[PDB]
Amino acid sequence: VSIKELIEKAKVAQKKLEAYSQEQVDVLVKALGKVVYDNAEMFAKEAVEETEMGVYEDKVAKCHLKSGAIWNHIKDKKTVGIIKEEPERALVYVAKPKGVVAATTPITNPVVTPMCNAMAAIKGRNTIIVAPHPKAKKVSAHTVELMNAELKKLGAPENIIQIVEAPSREAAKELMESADVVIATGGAGRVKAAYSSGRPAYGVGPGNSQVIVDKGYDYNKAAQDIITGRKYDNGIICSSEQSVIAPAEDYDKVIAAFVENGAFYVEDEETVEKFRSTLFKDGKINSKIIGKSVQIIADLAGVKVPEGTKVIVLKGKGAGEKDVLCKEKMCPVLVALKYDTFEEAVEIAMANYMYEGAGHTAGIHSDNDENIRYAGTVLPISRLVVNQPATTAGGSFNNGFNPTTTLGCGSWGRNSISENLTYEHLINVSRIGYFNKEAKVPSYEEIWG
Amino acid sequence: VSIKELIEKAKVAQKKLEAYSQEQVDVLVKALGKVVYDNAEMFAKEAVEETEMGVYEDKVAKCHLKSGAIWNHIKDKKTVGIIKEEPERALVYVAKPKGVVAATTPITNPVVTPMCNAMAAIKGRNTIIVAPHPKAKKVSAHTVELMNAELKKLGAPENIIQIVEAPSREAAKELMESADVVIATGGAGRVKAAYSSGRPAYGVGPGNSQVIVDKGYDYNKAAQDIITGRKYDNGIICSSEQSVIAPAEDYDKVIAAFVENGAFYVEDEETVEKFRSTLFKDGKINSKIIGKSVQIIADLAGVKVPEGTKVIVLKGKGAGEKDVLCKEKMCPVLVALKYDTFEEAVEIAMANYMYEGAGHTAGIHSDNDENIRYAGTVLPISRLVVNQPATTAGGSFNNGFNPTTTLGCGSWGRNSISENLTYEHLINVSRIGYFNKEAKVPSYEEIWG
């Protein structure tokens, strides 16, 4: 099945799907997330043992959280036909499909990403063609199979969800250039290909979530939240915490709070280098430790780490490019940096985002809202996460971030949107704009007064 | 001055401009539009006589309308720092610059487009580098010169607005690939280059505004509005009317209303072909008649057209690809098509958008709001214009369309947005997202009930 065949099958199905009503669309979208929720144990076991990375229980919770939070958010959203009337502007808003969606899915979330993109596309009467990551093509195609089985039970049009099993680089390039809109969730090489296809694209970016712990905050609570997000799925989540920027006044208190909650702190220079020379090879992350457990990393580094350790905290030689450990670490390892005062703490996180990860996510644990707002104003980020694990940046029942699996990084990460990808970005919103007669034309003084 | 120098000067100026407040930004933006308003007579005379297309008085009104309507819309908009608080979602919205903007400007609007893009960029503390069309580089650089003169009077940072005078295709390609965000207002070749640069881009599309006149409407009013938009600037406006889809019941009444208001109607097959073989060469528009007067087109066609004629109405052989006249005509010429009933009138316009211009603008003249809403729901357009000239789709004091010079065509025209380009698209909007504790976690029945 060539790409031109997949595109033609998707365009035919979309024209059939365009005749669907708001209710008939929502029926299909709800079942897409429910089948991922009901088969979470099977998908998580296959994804972990095929991609050779991640934690089984964490992917089960990921399938449960993503599928439920997405449908809970989009169940009452109007995305078909006329959706909003603004008489004060003499405007009527109409929601129209964009057409055929091409979605390249990653290896880290090979189940919830094909689900999220398909739910967001079908929500706006669009069809989707999935191109999975090669090391995850089996579990990603199995998710599409279980989703298409439920769509067939509901009499949905065939081929509204398609899969490109094992495509070449030219095939994925042929797919993105042929589709009406592109979604690229993965490495910077796949994202740059999306914005080079001559088509409007939605991409992601490399993460590097910096975490500021403010003076006086509950260090035990901050430690628990940061450890929970760092070890989540063995640390392959893009928004996962990467550093702990702690005040030098209470530095021993912050570290002891991490050690109390299952962290192994390393201060010795030679011992940290045993981890640094293992995690990074010529400034690049070692692919053999991506998504691996703490004991796997500890054995390869030759350092004794006690059993039950959740994360590894390493004292960094400095901020920014003073230490390769300040880059994105796709493994349960945190770099520890001390700061003098808050503006410098913002500067320390600023230098790490210039090193890698600008435009993604940051985390802060503080009761000082003047400090939280100052951090949110200066840092080059799309999402600031306050007093909770940074891994919740993709949507939670306790925060206001839009649930998604595609976190846009804005212009910093070379993306079109600096927000979470939802149904909104997969529909064209038009305007009917009437002739407002009651409005008075401003004069020269009324314009430039 | 190489492109790498222009980028470095723009990045330095943007970091200086980022320190500006909301008030200090609005001061610069107001002066950018005012200097184009105050020098409209000089800019319009130079643009007409350099690009060899358009009408002098129409470009004066264009400079007056665009500059005033844009500032009147963005004067009170918050685009610096924290701009919105949503306590019901525990969200705080922050507006951040995207960086350096690369804007390729067209030959048809070489004055208001460099102004609009610069006003929208500086509104969000961004800097802009303008790459003008070769046949309009003198008047486009003169606009940048007069704008930078006013910025210098106000002590603004130098080089927040730059110009690439006469760049090669490789130079414009080097500029778009180097900037943080791209704006491409021009032909489909320049737009496709923007979305192929590996950067997030905002483009336009070829227009082909179809106009439906409903049964029973004021045919004299519809004729006046359609003629006004067709002859505007000798018909080079992208949203300008291209056809008159009239009911066959009152076809003679609609045509007589056009003739009464200064139109020359042609019904003879051989005489229409004299125009068709002149307007189009092998299906492509003849560049010698783009933006030219009615008498210029009439002389080249060898057809006697009376003096004082405003537009030329040509009876088409059929809808869609049955007549090359149903394509975009960048000249004061309309194609006339009769329809049986309203659903077919929507189908006739549908076939012309499939031929050319899908995703742009349509016009309708009707008192039946059920028909207006049916047309707005089905037609593949970003803007429907009701009971007024379609050239007002770029913003008017009597409609709710956002004032702009960059009209996005959505996924149909291979653009990222299906709306008018404003300050909103040139800023990154981030979220601070607090931890909502009062929210209750839904259970299985509460999620999938």
Tab-separated table of N, CA and C in Angstrom, chain A residues 345-398:
chain	number	residue	atom	x	y	z
A	345	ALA	N	18.152	32.341	40.309
A	345	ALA	CA	17.523	31.048	40.052
A	345	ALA	C	16.813	31.047	38.707
A	346	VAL	N	16.162	32.159	38.364
A	346	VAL	CA	15.563	32.293	37.041
A	346	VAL	C	16.648	32.333	35.971
A	347	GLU	N	17.790	32.954	36.282
A	347	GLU	CA	18.891	33.005	35.323
A	347	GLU	C	19.513	31.630	35.119
A	348	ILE	N	19.614	30.833	36.187
A	348	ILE	CA	20.181	29.493	36.066
A	348	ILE	C	19.306	28.622	35.176
A	349	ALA	N	17.989	28.671	35.381
A	349	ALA	CA	17.082	27.951	34.495
A	349	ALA	C	17.113	28.524	33.085
A	350	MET	N	17.317	29.837	32.961
A	350	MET	CA	17.392	30.466	31.646
A	350	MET	C	18.554	29.910	30.832
A	351	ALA	N	19.711	29.719	31.469
A	351	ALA	CA	20.882	29.225	30.753
A	351	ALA	C	20.711	27.775	30.320
A	352	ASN	N	19.987	26.972	31.103
A	352	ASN	CA	19.754	25.588	30.707
A	352	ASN	C	18.784	25.495	29.538
A	353	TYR	N	17.806	26.403	29.464
A	353	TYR	CA	16.914	26.421	28.309
A	353	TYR	C	17.634	26.892	27.054
A	354	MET	N	18.595	27.808	27.196
A	354	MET	CA	19.437	28.164	26.059
A	354	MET	C	20.315	26.996	25.635
A	355	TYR	N	20.693	26.137	26.584
A	355	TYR	CA	21.463	24.943	26.254
A	355	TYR	C	20.599	23.925	25.518
A	356	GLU	N	19.415	23.629	26.054
A	356	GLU	CA	18.479	22.709	25.422
A	356	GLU	C	17.115	22.860	26.081
A	357	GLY	N	16.059	22.727	25.287
A	357	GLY	CA	14.712	22.655	25.810
A	357	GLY	C	13.940	23.953	25.884
A	358	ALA	N	14.386	25.005	25.205
A	358	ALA	CA	13.695	26.285	25.282
A	358	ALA	C	12.306	26.184	24.664
A	359	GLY	N	11.307	26.707	25.373
A	359	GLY	CA	9.948	26.745	24.879
A	359	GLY	C	9.026	25.671	25.410
A	360	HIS	N	9.522	24.755	26.238
A	360	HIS	CA	8.695	23.643	26.686
A	360	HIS	C	8.055	23.925	28.039
A	361	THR	N	8.555	23.277	29.089
A	361	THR	CA	7.903	23.283	30.389
A	361	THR	C	8.904	23.629	31.481
A	362	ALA	N	8.412	24.309	32.514
A	362	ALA	CA	9.165	24.543	33.735
A	362	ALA	C	8.297	24.181	34.931
A	363	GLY	N	8.953	23.931	36.054
A	363	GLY	CA	8.258	23.652	37.293
A	363	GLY	C	8.760	24.557	38.397
A	364	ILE	N	7.842	24.937	39.280
A	364	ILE	CA	8.176	25.784	40.417
A	364	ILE	C	7.376	25.313	41.623
A	365	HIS	N	7.995	25.397	42.797
A	365	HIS	CA	7.366	25.027	44.062
A	365	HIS	C	7.566	26.200	45.013
A	366	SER	N	6.517	26.997	45.194
A	366	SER	CA	6.629	28.233	45.951
A	366	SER	C	5.257	28.648	46.454
A	367	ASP	N	5.251	29.329	47.598
A	367	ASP	CA	4.070	30.005	48.112
A	367	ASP	C	4.089	31.499	47.822
A	368	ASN	N	5.143	31.996	47.177
A	368	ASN	CA	5.289	33.410	46.843
A	368	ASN	C	4.804	33.599	45.409
A	369	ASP	N	3.593	34.139	45.260
A	369	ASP	CA	3.024	34.325	43.932
A	369	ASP	C	3.717	35.433	43.151
A	370	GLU	N	4.341	36.395	43.836
A	370	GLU	CA	5.156	37.378	43.132
A	370	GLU	C	6.371	36.728	42.484
A	371	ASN	N	6.921	35.687	43.110
A	371	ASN	CA	8.032	34.958	42.510
A	371	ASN	C	7.556	34.047	41.386
A	372	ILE	N	6.390	33.420	41.556
A	372	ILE	CA	5.851	32.549	40.515
A	372	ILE	C	5.566	33.344	39.249
A	373	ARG	N	4.983	34.535	39.396
A	373	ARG	CA	4.668	35.349	38.228
A	373	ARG	C	5.923	35.926	37.584
A	374	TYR	N	6.947	36.242	38.380
A	374	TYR	CA	8.201	36.712	37.798
A	374	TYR	C	8.885	35.606	37.005
A	375	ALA	N	8.829	34.370	37.503
A	375	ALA	CA	9.406	33.253	36.764
A	375	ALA	C	8.639	32.991	35.475
A	376	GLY	N	7.308	33.060	35.529
A	376	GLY	CA	6.503	32.836	34.342
A	376	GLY	C	6.631	33.920	33.295
A	377	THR	N	7.057	35.120	33.692
A	377	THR	CA	7.177	36.221	32.743
A	377	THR	C	8.493	36.179	31.977
A	378	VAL	N	9.567	35.722	32.613
A	378	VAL	CA	10.907	35.829	32.053
A	378	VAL	C	11.328	34.554	31.329
A	379	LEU	N	10.992	33.391	31.877
A	379	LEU	CA	11.510	32.140	31.340
A	379	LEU	C	10.918	31.853	29.960
A	380	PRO	N	11.737	31.401	29.002
A	380	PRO	CA	11.247	31.058	27.649
A	380	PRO	C	10.573	29.690	27.621
A	381	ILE	N	9.329	29.657	28.100
A	381	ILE	CA	8.584	28.416	28.267
A	381	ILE	C	7.147	28.629	27.815
A	382	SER	N	6.499	27.527	27.446
A	382	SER	CA	5.081	27.551	27.120
A	382	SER	C	4.201	27.169	28.299
A	383	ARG	N	4.753	26.483	29.299
A	383	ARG	CA	3.984	26.001	30.438
A	383	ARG	C	4.822	26.107	31.701
A	384	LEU	N	4.261	26.738	32.725
A	384	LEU	CA	4.829	26.737	34.066
A	384	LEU	C	3.905	25.933	34.969
A	385	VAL	N	4.478	25.008	35.734
A	385	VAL	CA	3.715	24.090	36.572
A	385	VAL	C	4.056	24.393	38.025
A	386	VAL	N	3.031	24.678	38.826
A	386	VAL	CA	3.199	25.236	40.164
A	386	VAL	C	2.754	24.209	41.197
A	387	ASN	N	3.683	23.816	42.073
A	387	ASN	CA	3.382	23.004	43.257
A	387	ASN	C	2.747	21.666	42.885
A	388	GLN	N	3.300	21.019	41.868
A	388	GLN	CA	2.840	19.718	41.400
A	388	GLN	C	3.883	19.173	40.428
A	389	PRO	N	3.876	17.862	40.172
A	389	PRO	CA	4.842	17.300	39.220
A	389	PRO	C	4.708	17.939	37.846
A	390	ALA	N	5.857	18.231	37.231
A	390	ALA	CA	5.862	18.862	35.917
A	390	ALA	C	5.293	17.955	34.835
A	391	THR	N	5.248	16.642	35.073
A	391	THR	CA	4.660	15.714	34.114
A	391	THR	C	3.161	15.911	33.944
A	392	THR	N	2.523	16.699	34.809
A	392	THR	CA	1.114	17.033	34.657
A	392	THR	C	0.880	18.142	33.640
A	393	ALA	N	1.935	18.632	32.985
A	393	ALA	CA	1.786	19.711	32.016
A	393	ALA	C	0.958	19.296	30.808
A	394	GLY	N	0.809	17.999	30.569
A	394	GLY	CA	-0.007	17.500	29.486
A	394	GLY	C	-1.467	17.308	29.823
A	395	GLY	N	-1.932	17.859	30.941
A	395	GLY	CA	-3.327	17.739	31.313
A	395	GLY	C	-3.551	16.895	32.550
A	396	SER	N	-4.252	17.456	33.532
A	396	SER	CA	-4.570	16.751	34.762
A	396	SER	C	-5.953	17.176	35.231
A	397	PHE	N	-6.567	16.326	36.053
A	397	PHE	CA	-7.847	16.675	36.654
A	397	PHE	C	-7.715	17.727	37.746
A	398	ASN	N	-6.494	18.166	38.059
A	398	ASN	CA	-6.258	19.152	39.106
A	398	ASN	C	-5.553	20.403	38.593
